[PDB]
Amino acid sequence: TPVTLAKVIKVLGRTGSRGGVTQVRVEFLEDTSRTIVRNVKGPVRENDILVLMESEREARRLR
Amino acid sequence: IKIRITLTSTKVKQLENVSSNIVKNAEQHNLVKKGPVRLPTKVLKISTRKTPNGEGSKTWETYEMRIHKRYIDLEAPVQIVKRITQITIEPGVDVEVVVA
Amino acid sequence: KKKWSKKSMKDRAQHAVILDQEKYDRILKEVPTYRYVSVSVLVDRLKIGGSLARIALRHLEKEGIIKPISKHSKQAIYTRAT
Amino acid sequence: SLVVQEQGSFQHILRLLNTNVDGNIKIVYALTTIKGVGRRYSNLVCKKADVDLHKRAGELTQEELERIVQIMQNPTHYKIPAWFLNRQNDITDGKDYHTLANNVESKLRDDLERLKKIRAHRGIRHFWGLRVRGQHTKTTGRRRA
Amino acid sequence: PGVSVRDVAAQDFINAYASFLQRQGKLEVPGYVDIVKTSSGNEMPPQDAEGWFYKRAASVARHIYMRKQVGVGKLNKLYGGAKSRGVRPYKHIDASGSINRKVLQALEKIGIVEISPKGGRRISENGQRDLDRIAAQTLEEDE
Amino acid sequence: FTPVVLATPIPEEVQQAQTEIKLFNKWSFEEVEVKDASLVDYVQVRQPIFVAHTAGRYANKRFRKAQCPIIERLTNSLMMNGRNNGKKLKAVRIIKHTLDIINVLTDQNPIQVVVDAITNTGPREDTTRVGGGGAARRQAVDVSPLRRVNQAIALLTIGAREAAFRNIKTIAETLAEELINAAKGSSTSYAIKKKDELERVAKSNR
Amino acid sequence: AVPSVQTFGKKKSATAVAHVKAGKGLIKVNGSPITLVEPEILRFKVYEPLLLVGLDKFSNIDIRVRVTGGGHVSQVYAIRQAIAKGLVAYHQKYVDEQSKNELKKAFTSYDRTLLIADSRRPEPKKFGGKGARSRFQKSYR
RNA sequence: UUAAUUGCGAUAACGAACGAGACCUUAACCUACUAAAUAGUGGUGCUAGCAUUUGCUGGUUAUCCACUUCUUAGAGGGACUA
RNA sequence: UGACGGAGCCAGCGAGUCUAACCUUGGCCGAGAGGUCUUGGUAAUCUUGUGAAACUCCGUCGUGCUGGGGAUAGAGCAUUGUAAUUAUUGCUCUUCAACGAGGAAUUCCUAGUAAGCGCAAGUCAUCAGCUUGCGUUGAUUACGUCCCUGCCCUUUGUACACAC
């Protein structure tokens, strides 16, 4: 299971039609200086390493 | 002779100064006595429906009333049951003189 | 009417209620190989009913092999004492 | 260790008081199959018979089942309380009785028929099929026909 | 040392006092031991069959030691419990008064519990010494 | 050692418990590390406890539930299914009994087995509702480390609880078997199979 | 006039007073030794104040605690809080701060509930439901 | 911005009123006051059991002494987000 | 994470008789319900430490429409009342039926809260599965949204005004 360890540096805001997902600006610990935005279902504040099964998909507001 | 002054009322302020006046008459002269004993307040509670009819959302009430009971224990011969018997009674509170 | 539910258990393989001989040699030579033994373990693998494991679990605990690591309320945990 | 072997005297099934008594279970509870004997009465019968309560129905010596059987058909003779019987002060004679497997059902029909013949409220409602103890039937007792 | 009935666990002491009541059955044996249900809430008679009377006597005597005065209704309330009234919810039901009465009178016959002023019973002077001697034994049995 | 005997004596085993921190009296909290760096700082194993029965102030705010011992969380999540509401004295009894089986079978530190099991059964990807407007539709998202631990504990508890429904095996061994099998990543685990379902569903709807 | 101190403690509605005087190391609750609890699982929960710091400070004191009210766990939480406050009180009438301040720091460093009582109390029940927040089942049609 | 037309402020509007808030009761804190066999606590006598070696567990209103930590209260303090 | 039988076995709110007959302690009788002779109390004082239950430890049992579950009935024993019959209720034995986690749909809930547990009071001569309160054990799950069901303000449109 090729995963990517990424630590967030800023939370954009909770999104979704029922507010079950959150937009976060997250950077990867390995191969740093590259920053992407990803979705989170559970509670996240900062310095949380989420296991990214796939690291190549740009996130956006969900209906 | 074991005179005890029992006071029951619903108004705390009026019952307080009656005890204060009784205890102030006690600490004058000599009258070694026991101070006010603070019995727990008896809180009546009758819960009733607000609706006089049967129609309406279930909204209950609680009409409560607090009884404050304090007794004053005296110990002296007849030379103060000519003196203590002069009741310092305000509206509300009542006194019951009990000996032995 | 309608239930929308199933009604069946399986197939009750009723077994020993009184300890016999042909399995008395079995137990004495088969449970000393149990790293973990308890009431339910020989109920499943050794296929023993209700009121025989408790006697058998009391059997070896008092007599020999398996030892009281933790015998307590509704759980008698014993090991492969050797 | 309280472990004993078996020689072959175990019988997987019994037949007491003209009814099926399944083995493989304790004697105190294997006698509950008899129509008219419950957990307490079976415990009482086994206690006075000295049949080693922790014994399976199959692993019972035949000399103890007759002693149990005789207590079933005549409990009051064996020091059983008069208040431990299902049929007390029988309407026919008055002696304290105890109906058995076939007597429990048969005697039940006789008293309903006696109630029915006298045209009492309980008898007529029993024939009708409704409740006879005064329960509500407006919302209960539906899936009966 | 200074061991006593309060210096012992409940289960070990009651079994120990039951042990030192079965070996010589001096106290009594009522005629209806095997037919009582201990209450109107309990559904089945006790499964101890042969004993259960000195077991209750052991528990009653130990209960008497830590207290001053009790009554048969007090024992009924203590030894009662919830009753399964069919589909209706559970409810507290007192124990069998005759059973506690026979135990309490039996403890009087041996000389372990006697009547006390202000009503009720109380541990006996011979009762206190033997019950304390039991505690000195059950601790040293495990030692 | 310290053989101090007071006026009221205490067994030497309890005197031994004062050497190291609580230790559940037999099981090392130390030498237990969460393998995944993702679940660090959210699976509390540093703080030791005699028992898993404390009246903590954990639900008042957002993240004090992370500052809760992982063993205690297992007892809390084992307290479900309706009739088994409350009775926390029971819940720690299975936990103690189950934790023992993890020592008798698969002889490592059971606390270590617990922490690696939850890190191996926590979903990494999950789907979410996005129906927006048009009957239904799924869409895959990620799982926070806190939700990974919460989902991992919930899956283990429900799996053993369901597998103990109308079965001779007690909840103690059912919990032990579920945790051991999930610890080594075997397919027979209910929690592992559920993690496969959620990840596959999210992968298909990616 | 023999050395002695007194304290108190509550969990939900229980009370536990520890008359910690100068003795030979006797810890008793309701006349029974400390080793006889009742849940038999929280025995180490009441053993707590005994074992955080060590038994050497407990060798010159006797803690006698009487408890009333609450459930079995509430009684246990009353006992542990009372003896923990009893230990500091004995150190708060005889012994120095270094004995007391690191005693009174370490107790809260593990858990604040040893000295600070639980502030939460049962809330009154409101009409329309079996509890405060809970409400009866409402329906239409 | 706030639970709140609750405030900052803006401003052909100024000054206001009701509601909300404020207020009252209860639940929490007081080892600070007043105290108290109709609540207790400790001590002195009488007395019991175990060990007696130093103690522990108890019973006892006319055996008295001292205290209010726990038990109840009345007057008060504390919380204002510092 | 069970039922049953033994033990340990801890609460809070509240009520209670005068010219009446209430709360009843204690002793005795009865398996039990209950009966009997007395005692204390107009009440922090006596009922009552309401020794409550859920709870825990020993055992019985076993995955079995079975020791789960107690509807349905039969017989007997008592209490309340002038009167109980379409059983008031309580106690004992026996009969042991549906029900194996519940379909479309839907109710309540963010901390001692939910839920499990019993108690007191109200109706009361007797009768709780009800209600009002009290305490006991005590979770998981959010710290957000207007997607669904509704609300407030402003802008906008209206052939609505008993007003979608």
CB A4 within 8 A of CB A52: yes
Q: What count of other Cβ atoms lies within 10 Å of the Cβ of residue B92?
A: 14
Cβ–Cβ of G36/E9 closer than 8 Å? yes
Tokens of F116: 């690696």
Residue B1 approaches strand H within 7 Å at CB: no
Q: Closest approach of chain F CAs to the CA of A17, in angstroms? A: 7
Cβ–Cβ of E34/D44 closer than 8 Å? yes
Residue G86 approaches strand H within 7 Å at CB: no
- What sign results for the dihedral spanned by CA atoms F33, F37, F39, F44? positive
CA dist F203 to F124, F194, F206, Å?
11, 14, 5
CB E48 within 8 A of CB E55: yes
HEC assignment per residue over chain F: CCCCCCCCCCCHHHHHCCCCCCHHHCCCCCCCCCCCCCCCCCCECCCCCCCCCCCCCCCCCCCCCCCCEHHHHHHHHCCCCCCCCCCHHHHHHHHHHHHHHHHHCCCCCHHHHHHHHHHHCCCCEEEEECCCCCCCCEEEEECCHHHHHHHHHHHHHHHHHHHCCCCCCCHHHHHHHHHHHHHCCCCCCHHHHHHHHHHHHHHHCC
What are the DSSP calls for G25-83, one per residue?
S-EEETTEETT--SSSSTHHHHSHHHHSS-SGGGTTEEEEEEEESS-HHHHHHHHHHHH
Tokens of D26: 């304790």
**Cα–Cα distance for residue pair F49/F56, rounded to 1 Å:** 13
Q: Closest approach of chain B CAs to the CA of G123, in angstroms? A: 17
CB F188 within 8 A of CB F182: no
Q: Which chains touch A (3 or more CB pairs under 8 A)?
A: F
Residue C70's φ and ψ, nearest 5 degrees, are: -155, 95
Q: Using CB atoms within 10 A of its CB, is residue F33 exposed (0-12), middle (13-18) or buried (19+)? A: exposed
**Cα–Cα distance for residue pair F80/F161, rounded to 1 Å:** 9
Rounded CA Rg of chain B:
19
Identity at E16, one-letter amino acid code: A
Task: Give the CA B57 to C1' I16 distance in Å.
Answer: 34
Residue from F143, F122, F125, F127 nearest F205 by CA: F127
Of D3, D24, D25, the CB nearest to C55: D3
- DSSP-derived letter for residue C61 is H
Tokens of C34: 């149990």
Rounded CA Rg of chain G:
19
Give how many domains chain A has, as a whole number.
1
CA dist G12 to E93, F76, G40, Å?
28, 20, 20
Residue from F72, E14, F94, F85 nearest C74 by CA: F94
Residue from F120, F98, F100 nearest F173 by CA: F98
**Residue in the structure block whose two tokens are 């304090």:** B70
Residue G19's φ and ψ, nearest 5 degrees, are: -85, 85
Give the β-pairing of A35-40 and A21-28.
Answer: antiparallel
The answer to whether G33 faces chain F, any CB pair under 8 Å, is yes
Tokens of C48: 């023993």
Task: Domain ranges for chain F, please list them.
Answer: 1-206
Cβ–Cβ of G36/E66 closer than 8 Å? no
Q: Residue E79, CA: closest nucleotide via C1'?
A: I51
Breaks following residues of chain G (C-to-N distance > 2.5 Å): none
Task: Tell me which architecture the domain covering C19-81 has in CATH.
Answer: Orthogonal Bundle (1.10)
Using a 7 Å CB cutoff, list residues 37-56 of G near strand H.
none
Q: Using CB atoms within 10 A of its CB, is residue G110 exposed (0-12), middle (13-18) or buried (19+)? A: middle
Residue from G23, G35, G29, G93 nearest G59 by CA: G23
Tokens of D93: 């004679």
**Residue nearest the C1' of I26 (CA based):** E119
Query: Between residues 139 and 198 of chain F, which touch chain C (CB distance below 8 Å)?
Result: 168-170, 172-173
**Residue nearest the C1' of I115 (CA based):** F85
Cβ–Cβ of D53/E44 closer than 8 Å? no
**Cα–Cα distance for residue pair G18/G114, rounded to 1 Å:** 14
Tell me the residue length of chain D.
Answer: 145
Task: Give the CA B37 to C1' H14 distance in Å.
Answer: 60
Q: Which domain holds residue A4?
A: 1-63
Residue from G23, G114, G36, G94 nearest G64 by CA: G23
Resolution (A): 3.2
**Cα–Cα distance for residue pair F152/F183, rounded to 1 Å:** 12
Chain-centre distance for alpha carbon D108: 13
- Determine which of C35, C36, C39, C47 to mutate to test the interface with F (most F C-beta atoms within 10 Å): C36
Q: What is the dihedral of CA D2, D8, D10, D15, to 10 degrees?
A: -160
Task: Give the CA G88 to C1' H45 distance in Å.
Answer: 35
Cβ–Cβ of D40/E45 closer than 8 Å? yes
Residue E111 approaches strand H within 7 Å at CB: no
CB E80 within 8 A of CB E39: yes
Residues 6 or more apart in contact with residue F165 via CB below 8 angstroms: none
**Cα–Cα distance for residue pair E19/E137, rounded to 1 Å:** 12
The answer to whether D145 faces chain C, any CB pair under 8 Å, is no
Q: Using CA coordinates, name the residue in chain E closest to G36.
A: E9
**Cα–Cα distance for residue pair D68/D54, rounded to 1 Å:** 15
Chain-centre distance for alpha carbon F168: 23
Cβ–Cβ of F8/G45 closer than 8 Å? no
Q: Using CB atoms within 10 A of its CB, is residue E93 exposed (0-12), middle (13-18) or buried (19+)? A: middle
CB G3 within 8 A of CB G22: yes
- Determine which of C18, C22, C24, C60 to mutate to test the interface with D (most D C-beta atoms within 10 Å): C18
**Cα–Cα distance for residue pair B100/B93, rounded to 1 Å:** 22
Q: What count of other Cβ atoms lies within 10 Å of the Cβ of residue F140?
A: 22
The technique by which this structure was obtained is cryo-EM
Query: Between residues 34 and 63 of chain D, which touch chain E (CB distance below 8 Å)?
Result: 39-40, 43-44, 47-48, 53
CB F4 within 8 A of CB F15: yes
Residues G47, G53, G58, CA angle at the centre, nearest 5°?
70
- Please list the helix, strand and coil fractions of chain A in percent, rounded to the nearest 5, in that order: 0, 50, 50
- What sign results for the dihedral spanned by CA atoms E112, E114, E117, E118? positive
**Residue nearest the C1' of I91 (CA based):** E40
Identity at F99, one-letter amino acid code: L
Give how many domains chain B has, as a whole number.
1
Residue F141's φ and ψ, nearest 5 degrees, are: -135, -175
Element (H, E) at E83: strand E81-83
Using a 7 Å CB cutoff, list residues 96-125 of G near strand H.
117, 119, 121, 124
**Cα–Cα distance for residue pair D8/E33, rounded to 1 Å:** 36
**Residue in the structure block whose two tokens are 């309560």:** D53
**Residue nearest the C1' of I43 (CA based):** B42
Of C1, C18, C21, the CB nearest to D56: C18
Q: What count of other Cβ atoms lies within 10 Å of the Cβ of residue E134?
A: 21
